[PDB]
Design an enzyme around this catalytic site. Structure first.
Site, PDB file in Angstrom:
ATOM      1  N   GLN G   2       0.825  -1.200   0.000  1.00  0.00           N
ATOM      2  CA  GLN G   2       0.000   0.000   0.000  1.00  0.00           C
ATOM      3  C   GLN G   2       0.865   1.259   0.000  1.00  0.00           C
ATOM      4  O   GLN G   2       2.019   1.242   0.439  1.00  0.00           O
ATOM      5  CB  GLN G   2      -0.922   0.005   1.214  1.00  0.00           C
ATOM      6  CG  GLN G   2      -1.754  -1.242   1.353  1.00  0.00           C
ATOM      7  CD  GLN G   2      -2.611  -1.238   2.599  1.00  0.00           C
ATOM      8  OE1 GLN G   2      -3.641  -0.570   2.657  1.00  0.00           O
ATOM      9  NE2 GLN G   2      -2.200  -2.005   3.599  1.00  0.00           N
ATOM     10  N   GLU G   3       0.269   2.367  -0.461  1.00  0.00           N
ATOM     11  CA  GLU G   3       0.957   3.642  -0.713  1.00  0.00           C
ATOM     12  C   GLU G   3       2.258   3.446  -1.489  1.00  0.00           C
ATOM     13  O   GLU G   3       3.341   3.835  -1.049  1.00  0.00           O
ATOM     14  CB  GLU G   3       1.217   4.428   0.576  1.00  0.00           C
ATOM     15  CG  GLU G   3       0.130   5.404   1.013  1.00  0.00           C
ATOM     16  CD  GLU G   3      -1.003   4.765   1.770  1.00  0.00           C
ATOM     17  OE1 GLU G   3      -0.760   3.780   2.488  1.00  0.00           O
ATOM     18  OE2 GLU G   3      -2.129   5.292   1.690  1.00  0.00           O
ATOM     19  N   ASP G   4       2.120   2.797  -2.646  1.00  0.00           N
ATOM     20  CA  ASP G   4       3.179   2.568  -3.626  1.00  0.00           C
ATOM     21  C   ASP G   4       4.289   1.658  -3.118  1.00  0.00           C
ATOM     22  O   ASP G   4       5.355   1.603  -3.725  1.00  0.00           O
ATOM     23  CB  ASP G   4       3.785   3.883  -4.131  1.00  0.00           C
ATOM     24  CG  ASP G   4       2.736   4.871  -4.581  1.00  0.00           C
ATOM     25  OD1 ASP G   4       1.568   4.466  -4.763  1.00  0.00           O
ATOM     26  OD2 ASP G   4       3.074   6.061  -4.743  1.00  0.00           O
ATOM     27  N   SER G   5       4.076   0.922  -2.032  1.00  0.00           N
ATOM     28  CA  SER G   5       5.041  -0.106  -1.680  1.00  0.00           C
ATOM     29  C   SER G   5       4.917  -1.281  -2.646  1.00  0.00           C
ATOM     30  O   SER G   5       3.949  -1.405  -3.400  1.00  0.00           O
ATOM     31  CB  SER G   5       4.838  -0.588  -0.245  1.00  0.00           C
ATOM     32  OG  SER G   5       5.073   0.429   0.699  1.00  0.00           O
TER      33      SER G   5
END
Ligand SMILES: [Mg+2]
Ligand SMILES: [Zn+2]
Ligand SMILES: [Zn+2]
Ligand SMILES: [Zn+2]
Ligand SMILES: [Zn+2]
Lengths: 165, 97, 118, 144, 171, 167, 147, 107
Positions: G2-5
């Site tokens: 999540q959040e570009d991980s």
């Protein structure tokens, strides 16, 4: 810087028109004598100050660090054996100064100053008993004896209008 | 790491005054310096081994105060002294609120 | 040095913009005993603020960590912060809050009488 | 001679001379290696200008030049101020001779070590009573 | 000289002494931090008067140290020397620089420049002493001396004595 | 309150009665009112300190010749107070050596005799401390007394001080 | 993720997905400030050299350089240089007459490590000897690497 | 109150100030066509008495300089004839508390 002479910055218009802002040197008698009185008076004053500073006891000084320590703060620096004053930095026994051995020498120097400057004080007494005229350049032009023939300096004064210094 | 003006301002808005003081002093630069009661200047010679404090000019030796300021603050005050401003620091109030 | 194309914004860097746009009493005096507002006419809130609670907990925890006597019984709790929380819970913190009014006057409110409603 | 003014940094508990001392730069600490006691903390490791006190001596001076907003009448008067100084005439002529050394070495395309060696040779052989009547070009050539 | 003055001291209590007898701990630290303590502002403070009623108001907790700061006001007997004051005392040490006289709790050192010129050092005596044509000044000898100089630090006071005035010296 | 530096002041000298700005004649006490500066002679100071020590010994319990006096006050000192009593021990020894008067009635006679003069507290404490004999010796010992006390009054008051001197 | 991980395969990382070589070169010079003031490449000794770094000097050779192939870690001296100093001073307490030189060595970066890949010794335009040490490490992908 | 038509001569503006307590307030008819106070953006201004100002300062523990200011050229200040040091209680509609009272002293 001692005001024995004063300067005037007057420039004139010679016939060849090669004028420069020449300088005139003359004497202001009341300012000069007042300077002499002030100088010799305050010289006597701090000669008294110097002999008074000699008249308090000498204290000590540390030869290693070349710093003085009077008797008032040497007793904060005395040792545990209660015999020698040890320096705060060098830890060296304080040696004796000579402020008090030279008090008679300073008194003799004061006396030798005074008997030498006795003509000065006599002249000051006479010029303070009598009345002096406050001369300036314009007054001093009245009793001039001229110095040279082909003098580029013209002693005629040029008054101006608008100068309110 | 930089604890800058607006990080400080977020801490102010939080209300963490002691954490702010700890960041600015105990985490960056906590400098002890002596002043006197006569002049607020930092020109007090302190000899801690001999327990001797003295201010030249004022000639007072019993009116010495200890303050903790940032070294940046001390540098600021000495730069003002060099630029001929006296940032006199006093430990007591003089006027009402 | 470094040369990166990833534009990391220079925070706390407003002076570029600054240089871009540079042109456009009666009741109490001194520190007398009158500065102490008496208990009968205290006008502040009887509730402990969040900042008062935080500083009382921090002060009490610091004292407990520096080996102050503890005025509650311990249930095996070792951390000074929760010991201070328990002391606040059954009101065994012997401190007072000096709430300063803007005029310089202050009110003394003990932690025992201050209501912890938060 | 003179005050000591030296800090001899020893462990006050081990009492060992010479003290075994570790300067932990990354921790900003100076510690006694025998017992780990921190003797001095908050170690100090741009803003000024480089100056080697072997080539031009302990000479500190700044020049005057045009700024962002600068009237040229004020710069011309201030440029004559540093020139019309009598205290540093020896400094001015030794800097002129260093400038001649550098331009000669540049016209010859000699390396910087040759320039530095010639400048130091001139500085060491300068103001010597045995070397007063010899011509300045000969001093330059011999220093090179 | 001995005086009685109202004195005030900011004393710091560690949190370990925050007990039911905190006032007793305050009074005991007042004793072994004031009795015999030297201050240059108020002189050598000797004994604390009116121990039954010592003015202790509310003590402020320091915001970082966590310790309590009490501004204790008390009555005490002090000993402050002054320039130009004649006091009596006994000699406790002698040297070629001078000799110290013990007045109250304070040692006043009299330099070798501040005795009459007939009086001279004799280090051959055991203890070393000062001998003149009419009197001898040794250890444990009663002597009257004038203080003409006093330096006072934050925690130390040192005085300078002289007996060159007439009707001074040994008693 | 003004914030002048006021760094210029006269040096504290006993002859000029300058004892510092906080040894003035009036002192603001802890109760707020002004009071005369309490200056003690040596015997008076010895009796005040001894009274304080015996009162403190009484509080701790509830909570004459030179040789016997020195040991009595030494036992009193070690019983009453704890540490850092070198200075207080030297004061006790100094006062029991140079204590002109023994008991409270004689010393209070000295205070009332010197308060009949209406003189400075520093000057009367110096008179009660120094074992002077003649008026001129008193004037040269205390330069503060110049043009303050007539010679006949000075010599008579020192005469009954010499009479009150005992042991 | 999540959040570009992103979730990377650890097995693929082990088999070599996005593994990289990192080379860092350290350049150092010995320069002649004056006549006797000249820098020199050598292996310094604690008995006669002042202000030695707390890192190891044992990986240096007689020329003051590490041979290629030798593993180095953070704060390890890779270039050994000494400069002469004025005799008979008093600094830091640990000063004697034996300390004729002081250390101006170049160590490795304190956070890095790797293998000394190449050591190049040559002369500059002035003729002064100067060295370049390429140290090679391997960056294996891990949590926090950017893709 | 002197309601003029277009302008006042500066040679009469010097003698507009007269012997106290007589004060003169000059007003233009063009500015007086519309009552400014009837706007909804203008809240209710009530001049306080000396006792009311003193009670305000005592109860809020305030000084002369700690109050919010209103200039002695403000349109509402000229409408109310405010002199220096007079306080107006300003009652306005608040969307968080319904009624809100502020205070402004004339400078
Ligand atoms: Mg992002
Ligand atoms: Zn020295
Ligand atoms: Zn000062
Ligand atoms: Zn310093
Ligand atoms: Zn050690």
């Amino acid at each position: 810087s001692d005001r024995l002479i004063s300067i005037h910055k007057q420039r004139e218009y010679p016939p060849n028109s090669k004028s420069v802002e020449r300088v005139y040197y003359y004497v202001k008698y009341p300012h000069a004598i007042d300077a002499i009185k002030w100088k010799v008076h305050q010289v006597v004053q701090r000669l008294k100050d110097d002999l008074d500073k000699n008249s308090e006891p000498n204290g000590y000084m540390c030869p290693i660090c070349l710093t003085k320590y009077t008797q008032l703060e040497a007793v904060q620096l005395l040792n545990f054996d209660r015999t020698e004053f040890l320096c705060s930095l060098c830890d060296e026994p304080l040696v004796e100064d000579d402020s008090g051995k030279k008090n008679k020498e300073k008194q003799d120097k004061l006396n030798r100053l005074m008997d030498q400057i006795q003509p000065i004080i006599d002249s000051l007494k006479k010029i303070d008993d009598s009345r002096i005229e406050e001369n300036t350049f314009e007054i001093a032009l009245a009793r001039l004896i001229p110095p040279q023939n082909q003098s580029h300096a013209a002693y005629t004064y040029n008054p101006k209008k608008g100068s309110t210094m | 790491l930089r604890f800058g003006e607006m990080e400080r301002d977020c801490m102010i808005a939080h209300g963490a005054a002691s954490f702010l003081k700890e960041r600015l002093m105990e985490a960056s630069d906590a400098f002890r310096v002596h002043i006197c009661g006569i002049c607020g200047l930092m020109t007090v010679i302190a000899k801690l081994n001999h327990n001797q404090f003295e201010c030249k000019g004022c000639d007072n030796k019993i009116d010495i105060y200890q303050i903790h300021i940032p070294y940046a603050a001390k540098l600021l005050f000495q730069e003002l002294m060099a630029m001929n401003i006296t940032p006199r620091l006093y430990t007591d109030r003089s006027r009402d609120f | 040095n470094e040369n990166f194309e990833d534009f990391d914004v220079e925070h706390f860097s407003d002076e570029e913009t600054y240089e871009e746009k540079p042109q456009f009493e009666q009741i109490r005096r001194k520190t007398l005993k009158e500065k102490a507002i008496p208990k009968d006419q205290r006008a502040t809130t009887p509730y402990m603020t969040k900042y008062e609670r935080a500083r009382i907990l921090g002060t009490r925890a610091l004292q407990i960590s520096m080996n102050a006597p503890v005025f509650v019984d311990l249930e095996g709790e070792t951390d000074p912060l929760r010991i201070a929380m328990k002391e606040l819970a059954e009101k065994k913190i012997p401190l007072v809050i000096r709430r300063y009014l803007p005029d310089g006057s202050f009110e003394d409110w003990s932690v025992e009488e201050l209501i912890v409603d938060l | 001679r003179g005050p000591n003014l030296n800090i001899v940094l020893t462990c006050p508990e081990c009492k060992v001379y010479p003290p075994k001392i570790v300067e932990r730069f990354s921790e900003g600490d100076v510690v006694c290696a025998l017992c780990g006691l921190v003797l001095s903390d908050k170690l100090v490791d741009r803003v000024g200008e480089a100056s080697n006190p072997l080539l031009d001596g302990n000479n500190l001076s700044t020049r005057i030049g045009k700024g962002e907003t600068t009237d040229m009448r004020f710069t011309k008067e201030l440029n004559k101020a540093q020139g019309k100084n009598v205290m540093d005439k020896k400094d001015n002529e030794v800097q002129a001779a260093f400038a001649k050394i550098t331009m000669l070495c540049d016209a010859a395309e000699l390396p910087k070590i040759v320039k530095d060696c010639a400048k130091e040779a001139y500085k060491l052989c300068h103001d010597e009573k045995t070397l007063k009547g010899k011509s300045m070009e000969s001093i330059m050539a011999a220093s090179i | 000289m001995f005086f009685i003055k109202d004195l005030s001291l900011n004393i710091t209590l560690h949190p370990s002494f925050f007990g039911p007898r905190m006032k007793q701990y305050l009074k005991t630290k007042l004793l072994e931090e004031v009795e015999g303590s030297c201050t240059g502002k108020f002189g050598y403070i000797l004994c604390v008067l009116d121990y039954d009623n010592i003015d202790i108001q509310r003590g402020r907790i320091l915001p970082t140290d966590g310790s309590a700061e009490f501004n204790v006001k008390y009555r005490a007997v002090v000993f402050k020397p002054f320039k130009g004051e004649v006091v009596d005392g006994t000699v406790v040490s002698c040297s070629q620089h001078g000799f110290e006289v013990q007045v109250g709790p304070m040692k006043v050192f009299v330099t070798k420049h501040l005795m009459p010129q007939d009086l001279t050092f004799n280090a051959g005596s055991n203890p070393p002493s000062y001998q003149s044509s009419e009197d001898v000044i040794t250890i444990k000898s009663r002597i009257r001396v004038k203080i003409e100089g006093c330096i006072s630090q934050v925690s130390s006071i040192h005085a300078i004595g002289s007996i060159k005035e007439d009707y001074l010296g040994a008693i | 309150r003004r914030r002048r530096l006021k760094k210029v002041e006269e040096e504290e000298n006993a002859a000029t009665l300058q004892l510092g700005q906080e040894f003035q004649l009036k002192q603001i006490n802890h109760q707020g009112e002004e009071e005369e500066l309490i200056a003690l002679n040596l015997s008076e100071a010895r009796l005040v300190i001894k009274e304080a020590l015996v009162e403190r010994r009484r509080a701790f319990k509830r909570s004459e010749t030179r040789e016997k006096e020195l040991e009595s006050i030494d036992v009193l000192l070690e019983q009453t107070t704890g540490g850092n009593n070198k200075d207080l021990k030297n004061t006790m020894q100094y006062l029991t050596n140079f204590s002109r008067f023994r008991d409270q009635e004689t010393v209070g006679a000295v205070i009332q005799l010197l308060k009949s003069t209406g003189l400075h507290p520093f000057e009367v404490a110096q008179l009660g401390s120094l074992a002077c004999d003649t008026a001129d010796e008193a004037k040269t010992l205390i330069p503060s007394l110049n043009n303050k006390i007539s010679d006949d009054e000075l010599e008579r008051i020192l005469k009954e001080l010499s009479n009150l001197e005992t042991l | 993720n999540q959040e570009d991980s992103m979730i990377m395969n650890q097995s693929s990382i082990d088999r070599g997905l996005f593994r990289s070589l990192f080379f860092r070169s350290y350049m150092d010079q010995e320069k002649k400030y004056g006549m006797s003031i000249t820098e020199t490449f050598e292996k310094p000794q604690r008995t006669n050299t002042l202000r030695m770094k707390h890192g190891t000097y044992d990986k240096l050779d007689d020329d003051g350089l590490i041979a290629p192939g030798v593993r180095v870690s953070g704060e390890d001296v890779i270039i050994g240089k000494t400069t002469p100093i004025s005799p008979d001073e008093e600094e830091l307490g640990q000063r004697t007459a034996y300390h004729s030189k002081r250390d101006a060595s170049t160590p490795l970066r304190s956070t890095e490590n790797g293998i000394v890949d190449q050591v190049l010794v040559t002369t500059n335009q002035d003729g002064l000897k100067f060295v370049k040490v390429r140290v090679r490490t391997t960056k294996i992908p891990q949590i926090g690497d950017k893709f | 109150i002197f309601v003029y038509q277009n302008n006042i001569t500066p040679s009469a503006m010097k003698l507009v100030p007269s012997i106290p307590p007589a004060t003169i307030e000059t007003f233009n008819e063009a500015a007086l066509v519309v009552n400014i106070t009837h706007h909804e953006l203008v809240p209710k201004h009530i001049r306080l008495s000396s006792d009311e100002k003193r009670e305000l300062l005592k109860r809020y523990r305030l000084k002369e300089s700690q109050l919010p200011r209103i200039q002695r050229a403000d349109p509402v200040a000229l409408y109310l004839g405010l002199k220096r040091g007079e306080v107006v209680k300003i009652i306005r509609k608040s969307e968080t508390s319904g009624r809100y009272a502020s205070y402004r002293i004339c400078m």
